[PDB]
Amino acid sequence: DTAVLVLAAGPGTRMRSDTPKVLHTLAGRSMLSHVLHAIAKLAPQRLIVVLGHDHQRIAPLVGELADTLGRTIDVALQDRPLGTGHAVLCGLSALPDDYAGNVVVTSGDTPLLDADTLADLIATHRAVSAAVTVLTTTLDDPFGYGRILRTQDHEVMAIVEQTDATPSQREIREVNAGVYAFDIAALRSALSRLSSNNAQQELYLTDVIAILRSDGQTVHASHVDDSALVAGVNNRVQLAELASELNRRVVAAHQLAGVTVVDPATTWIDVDVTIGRDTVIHPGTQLLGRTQIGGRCVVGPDTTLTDVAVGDGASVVRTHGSSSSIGDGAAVGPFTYLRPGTALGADGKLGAFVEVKNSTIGTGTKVPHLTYVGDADIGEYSNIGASSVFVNRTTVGSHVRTGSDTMFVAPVTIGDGAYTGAGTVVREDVPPGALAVSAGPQRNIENWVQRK
Amino acid sequence: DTAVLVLAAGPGTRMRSDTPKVLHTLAGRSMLSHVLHAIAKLAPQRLIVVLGHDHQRIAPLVGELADTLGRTIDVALQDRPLGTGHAVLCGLSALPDDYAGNVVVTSGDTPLLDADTLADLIATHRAVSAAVTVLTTTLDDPFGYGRILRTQDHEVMAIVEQTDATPSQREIREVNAGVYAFDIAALRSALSRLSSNNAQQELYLTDVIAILRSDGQTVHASHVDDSALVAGVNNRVQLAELASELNRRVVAAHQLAGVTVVDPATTWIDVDVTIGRDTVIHPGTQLLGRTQIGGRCVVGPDTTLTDVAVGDGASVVRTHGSSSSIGDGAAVGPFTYLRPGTALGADGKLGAFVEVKNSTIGTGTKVPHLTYVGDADIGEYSNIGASSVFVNRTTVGSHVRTGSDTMFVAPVTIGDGAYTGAGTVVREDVPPGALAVSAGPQRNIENWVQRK
Amino acid sequence: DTAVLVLAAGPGTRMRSDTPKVLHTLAGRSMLSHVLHAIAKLAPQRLIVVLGHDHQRIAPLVGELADTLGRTIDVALQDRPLGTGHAVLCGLSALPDDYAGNVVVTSGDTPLLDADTLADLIATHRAVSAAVTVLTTTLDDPFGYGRILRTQDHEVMAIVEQTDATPSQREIREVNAGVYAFDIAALRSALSRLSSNNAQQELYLTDVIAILRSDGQTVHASHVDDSALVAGVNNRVQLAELASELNRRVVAAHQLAGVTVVDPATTWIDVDVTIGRDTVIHPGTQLLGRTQIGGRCVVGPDTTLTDVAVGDGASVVRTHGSSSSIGDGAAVGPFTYLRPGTALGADGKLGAFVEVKNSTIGTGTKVPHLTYVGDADIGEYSNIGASSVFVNRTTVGSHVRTGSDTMFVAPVTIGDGAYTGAGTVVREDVPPGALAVSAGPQRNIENWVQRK
Ligand SMILES: CC(=O)N[C@H]1[C@@H](OP(=O)(O)O)O[C@H](CO)[C@@H](O)[C@@H]1O
Ligand SMILES: CC(=O)N[C@H]1[C@@H](OP(=O)(O)O)O[C@H](CO)[C@@H](O)[C@@H]1O
Ligand SMILES: CC(=O)N[C@H]1[C@@H](OP(=O)(O)O)O[C@H](CO)[C@@H](O)[C@@H]1O
Ligand SMILES: CC(=O)N[C@H]1[C@@H](OP(=O)(O)O)O[C@H](CO)[C@@H](O)[C@@H]1O
Numbered sequence A, B, C: 001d002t003a004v005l006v007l008a009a010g011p012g013t014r015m016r017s018d019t020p021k022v023l024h025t026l027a028g029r030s031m032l033s034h035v036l037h038a039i040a041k042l043a044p045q046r047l048i049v050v051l052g053h054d055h056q057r058i059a060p061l062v063g064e065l066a067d068t069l070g071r072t073i074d075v076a077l078q079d080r081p082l083g084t085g086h087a088v089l090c091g092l093s094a095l096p097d098d099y100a101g102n103v104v105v106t107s108g109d110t111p112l113l114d115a116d117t118l119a120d121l122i123a124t125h126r127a128v129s130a131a132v133t134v135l136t137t138t139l140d141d142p143f144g145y146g147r148i149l150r151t152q153d154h155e156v157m158a159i160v161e162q163t164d165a166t167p168s169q170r171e172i173r174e175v176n177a178g179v180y181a182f183d184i185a186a187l188r189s190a191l192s193r194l195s196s197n198n199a200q201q202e203l204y205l206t207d208v209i210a211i212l213r214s215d216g217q218t219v220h221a222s223h224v225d226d227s228a229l230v231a232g233v234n235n236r237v238q239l240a241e242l243a244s245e246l247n248r249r250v251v252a253a254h255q256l257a258g259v260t261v262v263d264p265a266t267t268w269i270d271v272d273v274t275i276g277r278d279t280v281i282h283p284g285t286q287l288l289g290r291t292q293i294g295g296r297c298v299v300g301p302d303t304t305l306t307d308v309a310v311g312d313g314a315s316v317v318r319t320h321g322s323s324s325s326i327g328d329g330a331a332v333g334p335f336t337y338l339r340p341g342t343a344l345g346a347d348g349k350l351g352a353f354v355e356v357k358n359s360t361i362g363t364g365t366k367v368p369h370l371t372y373v374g375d376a377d378i379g380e381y382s383n384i385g386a387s388s389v390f391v392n393r394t395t396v397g398s399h400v401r402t403g404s405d406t407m408f409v410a411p412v413t414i415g416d417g418a419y420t421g422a423g424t425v426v427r428e429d430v431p432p433g434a435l436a437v438s439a440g441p442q443r444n445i446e447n448w449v450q451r452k
């Protein structure tokens, strides 16, 4: 059997945040969600998330995530901030006393930890018949991490916390990832022998290593060369360095699968985003949420799309949009705002300084300049003049030509093939094939300027 | 004599692209074009580009490039994907049998290879009286490249392909750039001795090295320290890493020549772009095509310009434009769209939420807010009110003041010094110095709001 | 006693600029200003800035800076470009002959030099009882810097200029930072023994080291590990590398204090900018000048703000603004332009394609689409229809609803709770609770399209 505990109990005081550390997000999931998704793929028999401060704020999101992953996720509360050693103990109490499996310990602030790393850890753990196996790695800057101590003979002695290391030890660049596999009897038995005489006056989980080494138990360290996989987040400088490392990888994966990305460093792609072959993404682009881009698209510089669906061969340039759909071969931008519920048919055009909200717009229809469309349904191959406003429901037919400077005052229906004169205010329905007008006739006042 | 072959025959399957590898672009030229420009500057007597898959799609662009560089470029077809060794052979068939020159082999996926490197290679080749000279370099990640094998005595033994190296050899970090100079008799004679018993069942050009070493011929390797100069492109992650390296260099060259670039990493400058002394470029700027910027300009953040000409001391801020000209001391932006054929005279202004298309706009005239100008010619020192539309030809005189919310319905002529009232629709000509109006008079309905 | 000289006398010819090197800016101060601020914090008894070329252009800004820092800053002119050795001499002439203090020499092209480094230098200088102490550092590329020469015994021999080093010496990677502390009698006495037989035919300050070593005086070098602290600026590639290093640090300091910064590399924050806890900054953001952001704000991608004040919990997305204030919980963007003098009350909204200039806008009022507001005061909880223009003073009351396509022709007053019909031109005052209209009635011309 195997059980995974997720240590999400700490305060994250160095985040300086009213929002709990473990719910800050990157690439579209919270850290906690990234950690849980990864574990879920490995499918251990039990899964326990230990919470402490802010638990009423984190618990409901653990339950939300248990439904999305379709499995039970238990929650063990930690009453006293008595250390991580104490947190494992709290977590074990959600396990039956008779429990015979392996226990794997993990935190929830390690968002790039993946299912293979855990697998390699369990496999290695079982292969060497070890009481405790710990993931290590080595870093340029090892600040804030337990250091790994070994004999002459390379044997793992102990783990010394940052607050507790001599200056001489603070130099050690092998670090404790804080990801372990334990034999359960050995874990139970060393947790009892933890004392809190140390710099933080806590029960260090990391003391368990020296303890089992004392009983002449087998202690294994498994070095992870790709340090990003087990990097943790304590503050916002680390949050962003890893949001950025994860972004590099998402982008590179899209590039190898056929997407041209002009500039990876300023192209942000959330984990659920799909993009078709031979589309080009220009720089300053964020593809967020469940956004889908077809193939042979152009996604223009300085574009932001959240939960937008874009068909094949469409261009979406300098566009700020969400919760909207854009058809094949359609043209959006530059300087275009899509609010929730915009659907633009195939071959359609929303141009410069156009805003659409909750509007359905038919195949091949063009709204190219300076106009607001909201709460409107517009038919096919229609053309909406510059400088207009759908004054919010309105329905507009197919093959319509509305003139510049038309205000459609909802609710109003414009019939197939109708026209509107420049500067018309439409307050009553327009029959198919009629010209609606309201502008007064021009009058020239000669020599007005000499006089005034 | 000297002949250059360009090996552009392969499939680029790892690009995952319906567009042939060698025609993907960076900084304004396709890879093929970058390679050919560089060779062209060296001016060898013959120049042969070997094509294979997609040759009907690549051939016409080779001919297009031969005219631009004003020299003959021959095309040798490779009938069977039988290897690069085979590709050199196909390429040699476009040479006369009596041919006595040096042959230099190059690919066309090496876009930063420059005329000096080739020169250094030919010079070195002749200096050491060598049968074969190959360019090498050393890399952090040597994946996918032939490895260079040497004796104890540092003598070049052979080149081993990635697919063919032992794990022990895959560690070697000296790589084959795939750029060579051959003595022709030696090249002909080792091409005949190539066999295809290897991992790809192809005729490896790289086997030619071991072969000439066998006949006790002179084999020279010339190490290139600047690895970017001979880096090749197999996939889109490599395309962008080098588009980015080339961009660093273009930008740095502009910085040393007097252009302030706030942020090189997000400033994209195509190779043909010229920029004057003491202009400042702010971040998120792309200067593409034959775009020219004068001096003491400000080019604002988040600006995209393609084949735009900008005079001296003009500002072009948050502007998306192409195929357009902007005069000295003019002001464009923020949030401004220039379509093809926009000319804005000196001291002119196109402001926020303005779109211009095919329009000529005179010295010192201002279009500052919320307006569409297309197919129009506007004179000098005129002022176009906010929220207007040139409803496309229209001509507007000099010293005009058109009021807000005016629709000029083409075709219409507005005389010098004329005015337009706020919300006028202009359908007939306006005499110089006349006030054109059409808006109805205001009426106040008192206490309407209590009633409704 | 202690006196600081700032060597700002050189020509900066490699800047290629009509603007003096030392006045090019980064993060909101000129280099000179950064250097002077840092020294000012240390508060030496005397402070002398030596000027040479362009001194009439730099002097008035030295005086401006003396008032801001509230202390006397003297200016010593250098008549002849006779070297840096000569420049120290010119600088000493502003000191009394009897002067007994330490002299510290600094340039003004070293913008990240900080008050601690100077302090460490003075302290070290006094601690070792040294005649001359020089700051050194070591670099990947030491080009253009004096090299540090030492015996077998690690004792500082001399400093050799770039123009003067053997190729063998050009390899030395310990460099002279050009920041020193001198015992004054020793400085006076070695300046007299400087001769100009060297590559630039100048009086090298750096020769002073070999000279004092000759008199068997104590020569100390103090190595600075953080090389950015003493990096100098000769050209625009170096200007931007350090503008970028300083930006990393400003941003990281905000991140550790509680600001989420999605992308540091494209987030530019000037030194005076303050940002509250738990605000998020998205990429492509510049926060320039005395800009202040409250807490829990969202500052949207692609935003530029200069001397903007933003309250708490407001969003400012895709906005280009300056000299303006935005209240708590207000919404600005996307695609919004704020000119000088915009004040938007708490809970207010300026939306897509809106431009405001010199306008005051009351609590909870919304200007959401396609409109120009300038020279206007608008009351509370009002709503301004899309596609409108304040045709500039206008006053608008509270709880107003103005319809789409309204032109307010200043000067005009709109009473509390008044309405305006769609497409109204307002030329006369509107009583509280009145409906102002001017649009003509709609007319449908049936079958117009068949006929035309
Ligand atoms: C359990 C413990 O006492 N210390 C751990 C632990 O420190 P924290 O301050 O709790 O983050 O996490 C580190 C791994 O992220 C690890 O290096 C260290 O050994
Ligand atoms: C009449 C109109 O064109 N737009 C209205 C309309 O825009 P929405 O996109 O529907 O939010 O409703 C808003 C009322 O919440 C109002 O601020 C705005 O003026
Ligand atoms: C001709 C050949 O057989 N192999 C060459 C060749 O491999 P390709 O898979 O054909 O790209 O190009 C490399 C240089 O880009 C070089 O390293 C290698 O030795
Ligand atoms: C009348 C007008 O102002 N603009 C027209 C006009 O803009 P262009 O910039 O010329 O493409 O022609 C288009 C017809 O292809 C049409 O979509 C748009 O409505």
Ligand SMILES: CC(=O)N[C@H]1[C@@H](OP(=O)(O)O)O[C@H](CO)[C@@H](O)[C@@H]1O
Binding pocket: C084, C085, C144, C145, C146, C147, C159, C161, C175, C176, C177, C178, C203, C204, C205, C206, C232
């Ligand atoms: C005073 C002198 O003769 N040379 C100095 C000096 O060279 P400049 O060319 O004047 O920048 O500044 C360098 C420090 O930025 C230092 O390395 C060098 O030793």
Ligand SMILES: CC(=O)N[C@H]1[C@@H](OP(=O)(O)O)O[C@H](CO)[C@@H](O)[C@@H]1O
Binding pocket: B366, B368, B383, B384, B385, B386, B404, C357, C372, C374, C389, C390, C391, C392
């Ligand atoms: C009438 C109007 O709406 N806007 C005017 C008005 O804008 P300002 O934001 O005030 O610069 O004054 C300008 C005169 O300098 C003029 O170019 C523009 O047309």
Ligand SMILES: [Co+2]
Binding pocket: A405, A423, B405, B423, C405, C423
């Ligand atoms: Co109107």
Ligand SMILES: [Mg+2]
Binding pocket: A107, A109, A232, A233, A234
């Ligand atoms: Mg941690």
Ligand SMILES: [Mg+2]
Binding pocket: B107, B109, B232, B233, B234
């Ligand atoms: Mg290749």
Ligand SMILES: [Mg+2]
Binding pocket: A387, A405, B387, B405, C387, C405
């Ligand atoms: Mg209008």
Ligand SMILES: [Mg+2]
Binding pocket: C107, C109, C232, C233, C234
């Ligand atoms: Mg210098």
